PDB file of C-alpha atoms and ligand atoms in Angstrom:
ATOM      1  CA  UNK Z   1      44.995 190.808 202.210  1.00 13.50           C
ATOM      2  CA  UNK Z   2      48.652 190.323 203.264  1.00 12.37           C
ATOM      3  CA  UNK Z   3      49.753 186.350 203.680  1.00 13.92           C
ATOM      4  CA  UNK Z   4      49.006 185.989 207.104  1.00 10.81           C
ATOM      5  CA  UNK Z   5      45.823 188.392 206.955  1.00 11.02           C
ATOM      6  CA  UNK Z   6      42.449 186.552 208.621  1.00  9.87           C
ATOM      7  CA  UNK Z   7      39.738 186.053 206.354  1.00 10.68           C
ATOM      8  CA  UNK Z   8      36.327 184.622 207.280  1.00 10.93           C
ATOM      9  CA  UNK Z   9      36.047 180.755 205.262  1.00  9.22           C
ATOM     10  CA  UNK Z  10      33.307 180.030 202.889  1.00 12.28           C
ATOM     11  CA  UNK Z  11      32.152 177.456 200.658  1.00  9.14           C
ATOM     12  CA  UNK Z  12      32.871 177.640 196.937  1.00  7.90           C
ATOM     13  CA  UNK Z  13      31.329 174.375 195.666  1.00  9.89           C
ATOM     14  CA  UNK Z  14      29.629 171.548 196.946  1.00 11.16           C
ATOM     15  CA  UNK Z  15      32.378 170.096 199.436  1.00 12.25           C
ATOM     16  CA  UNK Z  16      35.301 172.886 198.500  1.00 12.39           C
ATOM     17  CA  UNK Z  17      35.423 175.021 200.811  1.00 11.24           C
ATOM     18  CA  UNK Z  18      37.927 178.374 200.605  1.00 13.44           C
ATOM     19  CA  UNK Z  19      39.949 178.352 204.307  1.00 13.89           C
ATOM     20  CA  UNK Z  20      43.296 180.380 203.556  1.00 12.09           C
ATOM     21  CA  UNK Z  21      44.133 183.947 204.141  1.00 11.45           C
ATOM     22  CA  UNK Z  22      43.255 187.319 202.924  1.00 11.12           C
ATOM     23  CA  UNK Z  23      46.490 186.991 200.739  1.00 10.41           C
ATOM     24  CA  UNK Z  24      46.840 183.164 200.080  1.00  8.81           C
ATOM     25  CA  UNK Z  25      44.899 180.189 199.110  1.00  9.79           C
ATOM     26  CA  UNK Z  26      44.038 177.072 201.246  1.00 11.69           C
ATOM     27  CA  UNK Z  27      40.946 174.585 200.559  1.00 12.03           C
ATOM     28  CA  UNK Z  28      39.366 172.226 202.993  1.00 12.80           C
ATOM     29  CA  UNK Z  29      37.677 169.265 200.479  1.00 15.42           C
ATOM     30  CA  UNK Z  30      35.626 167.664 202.963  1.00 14.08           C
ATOM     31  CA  UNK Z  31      33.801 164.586 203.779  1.00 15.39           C
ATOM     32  CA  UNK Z  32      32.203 162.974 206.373  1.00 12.94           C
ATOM     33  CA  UNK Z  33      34.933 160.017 206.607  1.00 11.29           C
ATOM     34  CA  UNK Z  34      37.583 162.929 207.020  1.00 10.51           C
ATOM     35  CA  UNK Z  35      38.838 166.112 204.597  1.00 10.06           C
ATOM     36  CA  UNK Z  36      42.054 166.698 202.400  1.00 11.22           C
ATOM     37  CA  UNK Z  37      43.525 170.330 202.778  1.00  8.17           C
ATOM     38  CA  UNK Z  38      45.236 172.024 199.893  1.00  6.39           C
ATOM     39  CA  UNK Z  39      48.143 174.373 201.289  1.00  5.70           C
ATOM     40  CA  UNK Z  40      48.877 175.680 204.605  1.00  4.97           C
ATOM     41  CA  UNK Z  41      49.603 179.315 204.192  1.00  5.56           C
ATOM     42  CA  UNK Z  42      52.646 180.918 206.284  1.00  6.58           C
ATOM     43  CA  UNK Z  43      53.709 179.749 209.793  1.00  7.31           C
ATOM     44  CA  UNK Z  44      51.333 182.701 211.314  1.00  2.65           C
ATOM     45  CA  UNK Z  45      48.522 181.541 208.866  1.00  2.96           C
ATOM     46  CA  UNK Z  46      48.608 177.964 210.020  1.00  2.00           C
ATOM     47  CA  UNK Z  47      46.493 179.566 213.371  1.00  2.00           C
ATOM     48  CA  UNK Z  48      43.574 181.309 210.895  1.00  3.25           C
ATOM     49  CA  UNK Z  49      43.691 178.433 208.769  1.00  6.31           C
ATOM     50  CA  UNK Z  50      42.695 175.796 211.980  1.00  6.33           C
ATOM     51  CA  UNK Z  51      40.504 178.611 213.258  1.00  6.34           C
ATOM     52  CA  UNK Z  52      38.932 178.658 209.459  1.00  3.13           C
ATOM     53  CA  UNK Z  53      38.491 174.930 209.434  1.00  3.68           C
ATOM     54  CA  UNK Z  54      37.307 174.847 212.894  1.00  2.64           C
ATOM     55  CA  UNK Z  55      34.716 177.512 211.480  1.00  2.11           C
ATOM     56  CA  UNK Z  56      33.223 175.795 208.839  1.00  2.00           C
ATOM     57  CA  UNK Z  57      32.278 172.987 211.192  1.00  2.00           C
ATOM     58  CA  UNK Z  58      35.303 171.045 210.590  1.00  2.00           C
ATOM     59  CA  UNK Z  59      37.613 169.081 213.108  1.00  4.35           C
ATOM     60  CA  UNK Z  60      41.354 169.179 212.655  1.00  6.53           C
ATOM     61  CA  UNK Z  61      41.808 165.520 213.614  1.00  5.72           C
ATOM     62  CA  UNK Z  62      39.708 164.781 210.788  1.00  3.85           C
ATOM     63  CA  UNK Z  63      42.007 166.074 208.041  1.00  6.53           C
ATOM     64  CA  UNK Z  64      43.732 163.350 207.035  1.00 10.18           C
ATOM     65  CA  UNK Z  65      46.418 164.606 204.037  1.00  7.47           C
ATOM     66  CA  UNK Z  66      47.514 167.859 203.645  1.00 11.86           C
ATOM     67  CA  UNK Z  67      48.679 168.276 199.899  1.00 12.99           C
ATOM     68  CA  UNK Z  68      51.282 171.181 198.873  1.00 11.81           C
ATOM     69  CA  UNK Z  69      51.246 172.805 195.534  1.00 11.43           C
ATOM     70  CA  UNK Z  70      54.803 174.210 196.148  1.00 10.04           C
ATOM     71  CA  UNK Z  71      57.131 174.491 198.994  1.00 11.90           C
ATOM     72  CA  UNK Z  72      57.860 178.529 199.783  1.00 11.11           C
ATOM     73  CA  UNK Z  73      57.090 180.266 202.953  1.00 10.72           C
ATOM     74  CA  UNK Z  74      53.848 182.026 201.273  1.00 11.12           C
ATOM     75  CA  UNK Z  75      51.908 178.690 200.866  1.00 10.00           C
ATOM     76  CA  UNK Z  76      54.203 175.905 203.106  1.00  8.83           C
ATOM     77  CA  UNK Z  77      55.506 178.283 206.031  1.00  6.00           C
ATOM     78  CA  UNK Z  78      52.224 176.709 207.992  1.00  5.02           C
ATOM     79  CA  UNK Z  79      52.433 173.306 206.781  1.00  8.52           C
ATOM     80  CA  UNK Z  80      54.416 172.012 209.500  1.00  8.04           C
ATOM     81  CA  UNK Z  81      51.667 173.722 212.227  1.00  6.84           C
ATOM     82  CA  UNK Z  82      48.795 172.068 210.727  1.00  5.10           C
ATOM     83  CA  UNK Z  83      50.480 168.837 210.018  1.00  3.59           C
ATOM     84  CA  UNK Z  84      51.085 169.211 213.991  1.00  3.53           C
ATOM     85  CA  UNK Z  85      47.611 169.693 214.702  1.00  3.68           C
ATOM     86  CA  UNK Z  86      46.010 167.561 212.172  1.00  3.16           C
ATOM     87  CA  UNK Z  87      48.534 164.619 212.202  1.00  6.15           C
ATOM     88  CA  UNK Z  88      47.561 164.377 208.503  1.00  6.78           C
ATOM     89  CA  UNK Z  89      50.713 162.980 205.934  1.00  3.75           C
ATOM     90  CA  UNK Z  90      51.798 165.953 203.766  1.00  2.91           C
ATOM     91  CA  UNK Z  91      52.005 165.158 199.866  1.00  2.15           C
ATOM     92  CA  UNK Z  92      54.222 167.172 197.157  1.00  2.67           C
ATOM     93  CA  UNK Z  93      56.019 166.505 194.244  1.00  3.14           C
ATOM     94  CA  UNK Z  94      58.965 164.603 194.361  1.00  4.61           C
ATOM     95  CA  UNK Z  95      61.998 167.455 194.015  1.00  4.08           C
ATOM     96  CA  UNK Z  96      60.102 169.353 196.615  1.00  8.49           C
ATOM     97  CA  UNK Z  97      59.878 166.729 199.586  1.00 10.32           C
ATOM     98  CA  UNK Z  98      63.096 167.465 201.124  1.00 10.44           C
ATOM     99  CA  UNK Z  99      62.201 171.522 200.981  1.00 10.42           C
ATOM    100  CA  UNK Z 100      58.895 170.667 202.685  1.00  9.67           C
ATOM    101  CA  UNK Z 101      61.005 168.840 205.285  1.00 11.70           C
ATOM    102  CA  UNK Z 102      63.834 171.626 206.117  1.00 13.31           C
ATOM    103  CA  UNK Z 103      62.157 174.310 205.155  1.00 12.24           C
ATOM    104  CA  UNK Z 104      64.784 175.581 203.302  1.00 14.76           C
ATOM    105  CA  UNK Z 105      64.517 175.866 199.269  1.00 13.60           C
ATOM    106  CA  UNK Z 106      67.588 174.712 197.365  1.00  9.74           C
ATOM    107  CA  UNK Z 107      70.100 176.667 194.806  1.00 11.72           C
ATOM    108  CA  UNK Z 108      68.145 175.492 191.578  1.00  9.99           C
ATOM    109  CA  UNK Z 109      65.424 177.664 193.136  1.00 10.23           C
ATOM    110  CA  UNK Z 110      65.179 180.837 190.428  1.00 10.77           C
ATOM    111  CA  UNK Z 111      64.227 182.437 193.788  1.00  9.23           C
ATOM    112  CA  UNK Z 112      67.692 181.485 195.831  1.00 11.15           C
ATOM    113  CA  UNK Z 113      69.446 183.988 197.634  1.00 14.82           C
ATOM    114  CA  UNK Z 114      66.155 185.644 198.169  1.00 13.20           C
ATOM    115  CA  UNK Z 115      63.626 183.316 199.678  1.00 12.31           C
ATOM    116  CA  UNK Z 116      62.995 183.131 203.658  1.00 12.33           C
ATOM    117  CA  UNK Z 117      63.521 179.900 205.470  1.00  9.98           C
ATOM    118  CA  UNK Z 118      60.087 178.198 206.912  1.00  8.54           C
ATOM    119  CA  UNK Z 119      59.668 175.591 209.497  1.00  8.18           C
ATOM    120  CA  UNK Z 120      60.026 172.164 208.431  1.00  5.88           C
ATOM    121  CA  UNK Z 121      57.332 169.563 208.245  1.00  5.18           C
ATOM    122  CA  UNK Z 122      57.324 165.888 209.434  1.00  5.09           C
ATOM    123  CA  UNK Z 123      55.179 163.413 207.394  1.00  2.00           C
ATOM    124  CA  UNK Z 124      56.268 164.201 204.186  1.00  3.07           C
ATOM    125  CA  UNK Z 125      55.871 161.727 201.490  1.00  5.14           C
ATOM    126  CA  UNK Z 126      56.212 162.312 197.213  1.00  5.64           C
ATOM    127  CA  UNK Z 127      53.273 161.909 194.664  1.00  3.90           C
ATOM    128  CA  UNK Z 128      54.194 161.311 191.264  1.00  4.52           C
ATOM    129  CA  UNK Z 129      52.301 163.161 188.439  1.00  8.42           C
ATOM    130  CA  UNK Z 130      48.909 161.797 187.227  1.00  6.78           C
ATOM    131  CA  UNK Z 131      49.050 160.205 190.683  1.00  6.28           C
ATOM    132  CA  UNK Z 132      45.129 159.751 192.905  1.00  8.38           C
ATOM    133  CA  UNK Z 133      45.077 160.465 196.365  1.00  8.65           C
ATOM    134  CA  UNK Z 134      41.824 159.026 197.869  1.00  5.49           C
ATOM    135  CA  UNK Z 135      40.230 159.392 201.032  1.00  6.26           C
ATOM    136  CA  UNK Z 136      36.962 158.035 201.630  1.00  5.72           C
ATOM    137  CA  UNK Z 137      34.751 159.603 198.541  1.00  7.71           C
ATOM    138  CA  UNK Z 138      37.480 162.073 197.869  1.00  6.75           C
ATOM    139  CA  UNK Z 139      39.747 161.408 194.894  1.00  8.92           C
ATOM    140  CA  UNK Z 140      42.443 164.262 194.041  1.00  8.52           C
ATOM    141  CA  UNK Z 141      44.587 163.820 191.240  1.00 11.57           C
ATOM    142  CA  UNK Z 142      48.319 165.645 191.168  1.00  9.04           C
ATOM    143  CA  UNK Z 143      49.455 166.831 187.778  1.00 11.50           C
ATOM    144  CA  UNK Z 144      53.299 168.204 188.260  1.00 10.37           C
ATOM    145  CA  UNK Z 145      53.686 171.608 187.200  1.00  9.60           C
ATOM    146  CA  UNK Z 146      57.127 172.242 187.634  1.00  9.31           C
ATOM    147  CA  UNK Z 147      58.998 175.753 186.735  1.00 10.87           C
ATOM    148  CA  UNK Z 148      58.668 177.861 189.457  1.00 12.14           C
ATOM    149  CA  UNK Z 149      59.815 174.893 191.825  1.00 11.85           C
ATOM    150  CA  UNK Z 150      61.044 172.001 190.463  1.00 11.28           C
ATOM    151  CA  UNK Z 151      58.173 169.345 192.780  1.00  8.52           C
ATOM    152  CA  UNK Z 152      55.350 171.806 192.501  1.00  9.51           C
ATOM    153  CA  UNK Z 153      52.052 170.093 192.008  1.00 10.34           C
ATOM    154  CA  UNK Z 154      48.575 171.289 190.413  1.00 13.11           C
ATOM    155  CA  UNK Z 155      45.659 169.544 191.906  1.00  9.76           C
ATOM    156  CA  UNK Z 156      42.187 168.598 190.861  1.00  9.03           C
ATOM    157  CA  UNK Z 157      38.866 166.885 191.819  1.00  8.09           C
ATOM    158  CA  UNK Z 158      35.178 166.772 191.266  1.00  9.15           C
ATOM    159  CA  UNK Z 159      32.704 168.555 193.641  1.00  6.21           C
ATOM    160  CA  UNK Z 160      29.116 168.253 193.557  1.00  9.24           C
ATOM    161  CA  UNK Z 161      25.430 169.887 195.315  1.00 10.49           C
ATOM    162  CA  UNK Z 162      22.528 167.471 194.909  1.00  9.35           C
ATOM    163  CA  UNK Z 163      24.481 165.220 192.338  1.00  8.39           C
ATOM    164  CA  UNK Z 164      25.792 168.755 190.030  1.00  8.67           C
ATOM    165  CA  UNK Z 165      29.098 168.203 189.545  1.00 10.30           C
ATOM    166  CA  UNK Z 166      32.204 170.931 188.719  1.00  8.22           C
ATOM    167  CA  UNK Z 167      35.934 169.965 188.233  1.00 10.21           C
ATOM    168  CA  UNK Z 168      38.018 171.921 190.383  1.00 11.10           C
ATOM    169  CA  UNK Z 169      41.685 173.055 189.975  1.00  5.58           C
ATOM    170  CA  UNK Z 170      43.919 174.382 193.177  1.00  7.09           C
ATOM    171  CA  UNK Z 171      46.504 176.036 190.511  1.00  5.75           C
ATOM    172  CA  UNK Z 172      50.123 176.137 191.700  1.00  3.89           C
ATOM    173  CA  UNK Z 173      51.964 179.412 190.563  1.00  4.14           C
ATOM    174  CA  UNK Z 174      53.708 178.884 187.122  1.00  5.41           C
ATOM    175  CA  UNK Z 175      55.429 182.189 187.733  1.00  3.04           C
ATOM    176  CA  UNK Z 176      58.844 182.595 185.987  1.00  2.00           C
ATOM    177  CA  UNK Z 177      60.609 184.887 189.120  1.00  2.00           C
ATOM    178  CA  UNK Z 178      64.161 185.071 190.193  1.00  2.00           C
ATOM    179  CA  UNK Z 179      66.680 186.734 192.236  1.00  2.00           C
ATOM    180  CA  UNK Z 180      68.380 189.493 190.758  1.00  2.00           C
ATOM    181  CA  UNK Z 181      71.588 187.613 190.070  1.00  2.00           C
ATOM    182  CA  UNK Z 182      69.378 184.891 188.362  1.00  2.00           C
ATOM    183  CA  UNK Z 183      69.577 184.530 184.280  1.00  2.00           C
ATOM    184  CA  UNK Z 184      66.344 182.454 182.998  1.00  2.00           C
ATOM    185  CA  UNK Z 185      68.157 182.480 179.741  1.00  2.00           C
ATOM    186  CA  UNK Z 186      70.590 180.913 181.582  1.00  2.00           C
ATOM    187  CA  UNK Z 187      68.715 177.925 183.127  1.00  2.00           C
ATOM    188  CA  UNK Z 188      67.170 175.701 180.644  1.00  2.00           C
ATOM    189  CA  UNK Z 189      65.511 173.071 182.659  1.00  2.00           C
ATOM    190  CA  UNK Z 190      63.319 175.757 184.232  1.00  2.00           C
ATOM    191  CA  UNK Z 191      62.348 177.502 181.190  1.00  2.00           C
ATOM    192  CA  UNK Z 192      61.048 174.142 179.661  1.00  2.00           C
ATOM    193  CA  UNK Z 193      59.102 173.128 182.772  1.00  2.00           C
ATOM    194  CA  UNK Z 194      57.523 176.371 182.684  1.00  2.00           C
ATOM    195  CA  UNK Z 195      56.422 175.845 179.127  1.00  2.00           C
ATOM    196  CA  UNK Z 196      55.452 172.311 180.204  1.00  2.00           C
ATOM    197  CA  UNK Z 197      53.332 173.453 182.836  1.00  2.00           C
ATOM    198  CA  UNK Z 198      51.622 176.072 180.617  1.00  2.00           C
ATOM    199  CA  UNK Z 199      50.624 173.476 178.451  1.00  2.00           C
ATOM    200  CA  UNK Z 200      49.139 170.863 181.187  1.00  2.00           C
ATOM    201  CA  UNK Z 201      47.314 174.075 183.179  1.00  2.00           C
ATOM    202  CA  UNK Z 202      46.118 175.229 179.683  1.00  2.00           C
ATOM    203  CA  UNK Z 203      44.424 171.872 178.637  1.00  2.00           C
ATOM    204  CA  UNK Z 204      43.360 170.575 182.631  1.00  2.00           C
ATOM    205  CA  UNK Z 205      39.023 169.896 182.744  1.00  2.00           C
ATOM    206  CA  UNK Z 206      38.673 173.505 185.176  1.00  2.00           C
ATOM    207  CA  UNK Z 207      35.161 174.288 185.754  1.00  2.00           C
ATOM    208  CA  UNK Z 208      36.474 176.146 188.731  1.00  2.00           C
ATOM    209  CA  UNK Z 209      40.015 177.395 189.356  1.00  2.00           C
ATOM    210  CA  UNK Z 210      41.665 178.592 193.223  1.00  2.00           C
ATOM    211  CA  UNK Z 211      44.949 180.154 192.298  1.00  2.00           C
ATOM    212  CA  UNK Z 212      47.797 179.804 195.134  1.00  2.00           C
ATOM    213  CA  UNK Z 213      47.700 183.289 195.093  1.00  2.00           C
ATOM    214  CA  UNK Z 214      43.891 184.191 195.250  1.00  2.00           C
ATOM    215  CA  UNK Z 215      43.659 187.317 193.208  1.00  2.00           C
ATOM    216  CA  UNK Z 216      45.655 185.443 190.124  1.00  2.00           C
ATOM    217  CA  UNK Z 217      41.689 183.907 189.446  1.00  2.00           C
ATOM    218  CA  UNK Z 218      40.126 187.066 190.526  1.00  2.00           C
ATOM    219  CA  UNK Z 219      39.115 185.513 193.631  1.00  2.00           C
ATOM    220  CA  UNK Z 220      37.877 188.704 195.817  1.00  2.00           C
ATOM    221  CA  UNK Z 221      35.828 190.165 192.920  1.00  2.00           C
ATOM    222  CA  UNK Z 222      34.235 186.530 192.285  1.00  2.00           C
ATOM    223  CA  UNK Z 223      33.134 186.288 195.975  1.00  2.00           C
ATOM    224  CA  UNK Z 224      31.608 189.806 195.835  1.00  2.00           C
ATOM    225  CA  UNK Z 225      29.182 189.015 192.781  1.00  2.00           C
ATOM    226  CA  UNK Z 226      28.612 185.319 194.189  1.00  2.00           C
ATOM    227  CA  UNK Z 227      26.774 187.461 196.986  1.00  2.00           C
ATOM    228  CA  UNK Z 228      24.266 188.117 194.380  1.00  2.00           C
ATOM    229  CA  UNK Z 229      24.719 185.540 191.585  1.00  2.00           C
ATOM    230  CA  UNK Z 230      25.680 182.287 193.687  1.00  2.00           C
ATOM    231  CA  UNK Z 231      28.576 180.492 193.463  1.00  2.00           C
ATOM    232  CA  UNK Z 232      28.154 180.413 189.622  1.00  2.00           C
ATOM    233  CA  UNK Z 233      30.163 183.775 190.325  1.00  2.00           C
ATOM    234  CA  UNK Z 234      33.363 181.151 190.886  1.00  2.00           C
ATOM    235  CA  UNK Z 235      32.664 179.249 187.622  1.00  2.00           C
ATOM    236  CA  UNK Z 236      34.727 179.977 184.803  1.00  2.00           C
ATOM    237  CA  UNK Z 237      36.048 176.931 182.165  1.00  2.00           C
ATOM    238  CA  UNK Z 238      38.163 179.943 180.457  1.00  2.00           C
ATOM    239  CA  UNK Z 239      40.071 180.059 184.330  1.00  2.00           C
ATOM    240  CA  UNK Z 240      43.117 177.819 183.941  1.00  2.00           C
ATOM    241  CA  UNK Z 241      43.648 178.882 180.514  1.00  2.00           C
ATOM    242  CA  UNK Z 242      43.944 182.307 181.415  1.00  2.00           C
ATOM    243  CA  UNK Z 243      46.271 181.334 184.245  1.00  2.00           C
ATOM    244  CA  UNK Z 244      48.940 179.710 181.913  1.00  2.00           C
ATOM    245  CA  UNK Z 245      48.230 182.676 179.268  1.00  2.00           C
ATOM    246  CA  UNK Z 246      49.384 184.972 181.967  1.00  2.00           C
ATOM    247  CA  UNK Z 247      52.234 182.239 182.846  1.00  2.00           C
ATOM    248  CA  UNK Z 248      53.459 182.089 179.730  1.00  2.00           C
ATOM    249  CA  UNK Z 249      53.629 186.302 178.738  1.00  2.00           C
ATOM    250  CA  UNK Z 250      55.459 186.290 182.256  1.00  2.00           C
ATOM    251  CA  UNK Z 251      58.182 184.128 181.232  1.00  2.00           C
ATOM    252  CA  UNK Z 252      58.182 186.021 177.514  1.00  2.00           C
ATOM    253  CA  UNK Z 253      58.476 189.226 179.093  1.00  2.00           C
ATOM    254  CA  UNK Z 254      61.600 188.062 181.044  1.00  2.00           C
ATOM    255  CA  UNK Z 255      63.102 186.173 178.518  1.00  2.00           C
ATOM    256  CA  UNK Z 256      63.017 188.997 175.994  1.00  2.00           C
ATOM    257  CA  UNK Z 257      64.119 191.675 179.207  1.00  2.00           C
ATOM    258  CA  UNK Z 258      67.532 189.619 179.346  1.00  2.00           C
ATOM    259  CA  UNK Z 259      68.111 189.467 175.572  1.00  2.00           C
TER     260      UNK Z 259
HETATM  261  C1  LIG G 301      57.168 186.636 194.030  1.00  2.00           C
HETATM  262  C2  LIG G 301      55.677 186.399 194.240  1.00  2.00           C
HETATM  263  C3  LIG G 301      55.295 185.704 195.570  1.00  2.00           C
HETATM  264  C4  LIG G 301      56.314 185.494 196.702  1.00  2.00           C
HETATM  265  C5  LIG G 301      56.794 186.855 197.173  1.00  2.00           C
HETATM  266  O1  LIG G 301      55.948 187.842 197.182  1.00  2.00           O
HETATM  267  O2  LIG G 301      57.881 186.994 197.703  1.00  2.00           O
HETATM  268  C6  LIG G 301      57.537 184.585 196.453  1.00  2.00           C
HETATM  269  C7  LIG G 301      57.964 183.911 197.765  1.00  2.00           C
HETATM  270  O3  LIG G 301      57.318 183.576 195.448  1.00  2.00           O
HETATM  271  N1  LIG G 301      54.716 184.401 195.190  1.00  2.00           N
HETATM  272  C8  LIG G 301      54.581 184.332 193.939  1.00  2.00           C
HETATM  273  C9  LIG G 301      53.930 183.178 193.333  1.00  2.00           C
HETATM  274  O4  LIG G 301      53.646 183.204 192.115  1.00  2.00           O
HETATM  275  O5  LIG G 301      53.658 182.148 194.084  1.00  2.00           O
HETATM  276  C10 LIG G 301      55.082 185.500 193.128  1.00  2.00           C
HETATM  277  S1  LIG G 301      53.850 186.283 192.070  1.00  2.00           S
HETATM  278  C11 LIG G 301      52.393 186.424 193.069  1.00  2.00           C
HETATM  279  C12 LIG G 301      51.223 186.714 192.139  1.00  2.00           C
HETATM  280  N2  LIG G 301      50.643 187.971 192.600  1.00  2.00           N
HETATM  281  C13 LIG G 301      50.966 188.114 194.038  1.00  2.00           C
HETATM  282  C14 LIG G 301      50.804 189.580 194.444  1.00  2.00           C
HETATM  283  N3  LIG G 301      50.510 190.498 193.305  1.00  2.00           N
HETATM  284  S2  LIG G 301      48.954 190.735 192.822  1.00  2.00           S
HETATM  285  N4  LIG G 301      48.062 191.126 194.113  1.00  2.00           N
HETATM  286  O6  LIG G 301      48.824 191.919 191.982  1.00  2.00           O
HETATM  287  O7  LIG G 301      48.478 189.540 192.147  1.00  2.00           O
HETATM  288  C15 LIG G 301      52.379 187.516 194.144  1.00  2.00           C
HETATM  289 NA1  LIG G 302      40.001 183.971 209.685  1.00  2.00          NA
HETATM  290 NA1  LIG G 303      55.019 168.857 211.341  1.00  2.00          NA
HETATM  291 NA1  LIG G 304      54.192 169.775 195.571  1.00  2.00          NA
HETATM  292 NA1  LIG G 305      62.158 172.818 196.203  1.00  2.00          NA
HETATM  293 NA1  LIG G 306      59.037 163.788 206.565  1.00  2.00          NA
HETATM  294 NA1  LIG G 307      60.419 181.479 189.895  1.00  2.00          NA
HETATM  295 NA1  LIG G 308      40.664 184.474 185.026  1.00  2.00          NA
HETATM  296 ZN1  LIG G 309      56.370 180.492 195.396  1.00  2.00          ZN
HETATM  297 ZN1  LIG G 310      53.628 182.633 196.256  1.00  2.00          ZN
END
């Protein structure tokens, strides 16, 4: 399950289908007048990630936006290859546009001096937060959840089988992380979008949550009793609650190490 790992796709709900690595989230929301894809994975994962598509029955022309939750080489390092192969537009908060671009994060990163360069994307454009993206049928709606990059961007939708519906959350990481020179006692503005974005994650309609990082939602141990139980296995309203909970005693623990 490292970043770039291969993992064989599958559907989670209705028209969200799981097509990242063994280490890192991507979804494929699909329709039949073309498909949104949440994340890219690294530069080597870009290649499972169009074989994954491809997989599911998919066609890479078809995906028309690719939307990033936030711009490091774990989840954007393959942005720029499937923007290549898709010609989709790339979407991401605002303060992270010009990172998705460069592929280079900048020094308000809590990360900088530490984080590896990725290739840069074209077709980058900003959403603001509470903003729709539609496609066809497909409606996405970005809620910024800033703090452990200033643009990063938590994404939802509906799903539905045979008119049963779920809301679905693609969580960014609210992760309070830094380079070892880096004081978050220091940095104010992070600290308070980190609380901010505990409290949007905490109260976001999340039927189903896909953490950026799989594993943060339990993903592996979901998919194993869906075998048996369905993909009931992935439902859990308690999910992005639990994900800020753990958020927020990150930061605490942190804060409280550099008192
Ligand atoms: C530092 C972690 C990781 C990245 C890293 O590993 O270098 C970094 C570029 O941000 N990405 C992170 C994120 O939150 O997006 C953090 S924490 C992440 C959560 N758990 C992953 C692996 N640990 S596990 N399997 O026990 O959950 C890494
Ligand atoms: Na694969
Ligand atoms: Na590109
Ligand atoms: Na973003
Ligand atoms: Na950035
Ligand atoms: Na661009
Ligand atoms: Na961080
Ligand atoms: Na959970
Ligand atoms: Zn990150
Ligand atoms: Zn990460």
């Amino acid at each position: 399950r490292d970043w770039s790992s291969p993992q064989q796709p599958f559907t989670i709900y209705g028209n969200t289908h799981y097509v990242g690595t063994g280490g890192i989230s991507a979804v494929l929301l699909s329709s039949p007048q073309g498909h949104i894809l949440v994340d890219g994975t690294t530069e080597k994962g870009a290649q499972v990630v169009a074989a994954n598509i491809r997989a599911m029955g998919f066609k890479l022309s078809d995906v028309k936006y690719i939307l990033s939750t936030h711009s490091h080489e774990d989840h954007a390092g393959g942005i720029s290859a499937m923007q290549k192969l898709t010609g989709a537009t790339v979407l991401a908060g605002a303060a992270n546009v010009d990172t998705l671009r460069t592929g280079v994060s900048p020094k308000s990163d809590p990360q900088f001096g530490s984080l590896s360069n990725f290739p840069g994307s074209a077709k980058v454009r900003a959403v603001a937060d509470g903003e729709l993206v539609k496609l066809g049928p497909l409606a996405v709606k970005a809620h910024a959840t800033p703090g452990h990059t200033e643009g990063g961007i938590t994404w939802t939708w509906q799903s539905c089988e045979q008119g049963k519906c779920k809301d679905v959350v693609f969580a960014d990481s609210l992760t309070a992380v830094s380079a070892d020179s880096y004081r978050f006692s220091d940095h104010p503005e992070v600290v308070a979008s980190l609380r901010g974005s505990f409290e949007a994650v905490e109260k976001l309609s999340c039927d189903i949550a896909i953490a950026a990082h799989p594993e943060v939602n339990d993903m592996w141990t979901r998919q194993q009793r869906a075998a048996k139980e369905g993909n009931s296995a992935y439902v859990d309203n308690g999910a992005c609650r639990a994900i800020a909970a753990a958020g927020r005693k990150r930061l605490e623990t942190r804060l409280a190490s550099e008192k």
